[PDB]
Enzyme design. Structure first.
Site, short mmCIF file in Angstrom:
data_model
loop_
_atom_site.label_atom_id
_atom_site.label_comp_id
_atom_site.label_asym_id
_atom_site.label_seq_id
_atom_site.Cartn_x
_atom_site.Cartn_y
_atom_site.Cartn_z
N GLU A 1 0.99 3.86 1.79
CA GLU A 1 1.60 4.21 3.16
C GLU A 1 2.83 3.12 3.63
O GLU A 1 3.82 3.71 4.13
CB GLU A 1 0.55 4.18 4.48
CG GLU A 1 -0.83 5.02 3.99
CD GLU A 1 -1.75 4.15 3.13
OE1 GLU A 1 -1.66 3.68 2.07
OE2 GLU A 1 -3.07 4.19 3.59
N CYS B 1 -6.00 1.98 5.60
CA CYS B 1 -6.93 1.09 5.83
C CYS B 1 -6.37 0.39 7.02
O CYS B 1 -5.64 0.97 7.91
CB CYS B 1 -6.54 -0.07 4.80
SG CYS B 1 -5.13 -0.96 4.96
N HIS C 1 0.77 -1.06 -0.01
CA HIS C 1 0.04 -0.04 0.19
C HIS C 1 0.83 1.23 -0.03
O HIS C 1 1.99 1.18 0.31
CB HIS C 1 -0.97 0.13 1.29
CG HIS C 1 -2.10 -1.09 1.11
ND1 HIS C 1 -3.23 -0.91 1.71
CD2 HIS C 1 -2.32 -2.20 0.24
CE1 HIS C 1 -4.05 -2.02 1.45
NE2 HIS C 1 -3.20 -2.77 0.56
N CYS D 1 -2.57 -0.50 7.51
CA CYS D 1 -1.87 0.97 7.33
C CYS D 1 -2.00 1.57 8.54
O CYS D 1 -1.06 2.27 9.18
CB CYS D 1 -1.91 1.73 6.34
SG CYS D 1 -1.65 0.89 4.81
ZN LIG Z 1 -3.52 0.25 3.51
#
Ligand SMILES: [Zn+2]
Ligand SMILES: [Zn+2]
Lengths: 284, 162
Positions: free
Chosen positions: B60, B94, B58, B97
């Site tokens: 992040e 999410c 992801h 993260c």
């Molecule tokens: Zn994430």
């Protein structure tokens, strides 16, 4: 000595719900298999394959007797005769006694304690009341022992004592062994995260990003929120862990494997080699 | 040294939106993000899951790894940098993260639109501010910045994916 306990959503964790059915006593035991065949031809009970149709019972002197499960009760669960329930000549009811109402489990049981409640009302299938076979329990013990060894190497080096193994259950082949490698410079190298990277780096050119599809994870203690949700994103298929973690996300504080609003769900069992694992470090 | 970065919020979020548009062009979940420490961009990232064949990459997570590289390369301890770093990201982090940012002790996240499929700052779980005494520290959020543009990118992506 250890025992695998499913970790289910709170929805699936409660008592099984009961429905009403008609049974009848088998007064002529030597008609049992004929009656079973004729009655279940008429009433196959498609929505309830977990139910055994013959309920044995042992008297205070060891005499065996049986009740036969005839059919589900209708909207009006009134008393019913054999003549009302069993069409002839599809069924020759000779050998049966008067039908009676009985509650039966609506759905198969999943936990061993649901199987206990269910068994009390009417015999049910279940996956003995064993969750995993001897051959299986032995396999699971081997992989966790490997996870425990990895956690112990971590501890000997001064790393967080968490170990994990990723297994392809098609071939029972170990694809990755890893322990926590977190350091001041790299604080997010939890055992699970290390293992996901290892599985990823061994995958081929035509792989999807769902690195863990179809695989089993064995990890010594329950994953934190980061590792647990990483397993959702990577689509692990089953996770076995030994001991819970205080902030764990596969049983303790969250159950991110068992949610309807996430696009992936997977089975989780806790307790595998728990007495060994309980002395290792929690995650994080 | 935290609110000093917030002064340029428009600039940082514009660059994050630029990166998110790139992610969309490359058939990735269109998330762009920057991490700012002392008015300097010390790391940045877009969701690279499809490119890298690795579901954990992801935006992040990519940004965090870059900041850690910066700390390693300049003899800075991650503690003193991350505790005064602000994350600017086009989408609510999410669950995964959010947890990673807690463990890094990021104090502050500025983000655009909600993440209704996976959000960890409220939409699905509130990891950001949950009482999790063994999982780093809670962080605070400034949500909704250019949320309408950010959520249009998400909607476009999820129509194109199978
Ligand atoms: Zn994430
Ligand atoms: Zn973890």
């Amino acid at each position: 000595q250890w025992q695998a306990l499913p970790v289910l959503s709170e929805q699936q964790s409660g008592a099984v719900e009961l429905i009403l059915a008609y049974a009848a006593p088998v007064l002529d035991k030597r008609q049992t298999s004929r009656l079973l065949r004729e009655v279940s031809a008429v009433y196959p009970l498609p929505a309830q394959p977990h139910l055994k149709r013959v309920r044995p019972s042992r008297s205070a002197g060891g005499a065996q007797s049986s009740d036969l499960l005839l059919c589900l009760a209708g909207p009006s669960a009134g008393p019913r005769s054999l003549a009302e329930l069993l069409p002839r000549p599809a069924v020759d009811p000779r050998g049966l006694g008067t039908p009676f109402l009985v509650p039966v489990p609506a759905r198969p049981p999943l936990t061993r304690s649901q199987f206990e409640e269910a068994r009390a009302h009417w015999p049910t299938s279940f996956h003995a009341g064993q969750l995993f076979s001897t051959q299986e329990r032995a396999a699971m013990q081997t992989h966790m022992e490997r996870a425990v060894c990895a956690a112990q190497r971590a501890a000997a080096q001064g790393l967080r004592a968490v170990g994990a193994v990723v297994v392809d259950p098609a071939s029972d082949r170990v694809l990755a062994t890893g322990h926590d490698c977190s350091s001041v410079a790299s604080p997010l190298l939890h055992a699970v995260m290390v293992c996901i990277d290892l599985v990823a780096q061994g995958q081929g050119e035509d792989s999807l990003p769902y690195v863990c599809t179809g695989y089993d994870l064995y990890v010594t203690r329950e994953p934190c929120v980061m590792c647990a949700m990483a397993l959702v994103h990577a689509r692990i298929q089953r996770v076995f862990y030994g001991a819970p973690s205080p902030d764990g996300a596969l049983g303790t504080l969250f159950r991110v494997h068992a949610r309807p609003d996430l696009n992936h769900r997977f089975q989780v069992f806790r307790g595998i080699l728990e007495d060994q694992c309980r002395q290792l470090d929690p995650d994080p | 040294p935290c609110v000093v970065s917030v002064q340029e919020t428009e600039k940082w979020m514009e660059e994050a939106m630029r990166m998110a548009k790139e992610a969309l062009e490359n058939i990735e979940v269109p998330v762009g993000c920057l991490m700012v420490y002392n008015n300097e961009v010390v790391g940045k990232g877009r969701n690279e899951v499809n490119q890298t064949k690795n579901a954990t990459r992801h935006a992040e997570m990519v940004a965090i790894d870059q900041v850690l590289d910066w700390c390693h390369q300049h003899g800075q301890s991650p503690s003193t940098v991350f505790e005064h770093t602000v994350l600017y990201v086009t989408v609510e982090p999410c669950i995964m993260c959010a947890a990673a940012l807690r463990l890094m002790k990021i104090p502050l996240v500025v983000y655009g639109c909600q993440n209704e499929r996976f959000g960890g700052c409220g939409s699905v779980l509130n990891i950001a501010s949950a009482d999790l005494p063994n999982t780093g520290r809670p962080f605070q959020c400034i949500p909704g910045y250019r949320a309408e543009e950010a959520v249009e990118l998400l909607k476009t992506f999820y129509k194109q994916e199978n």
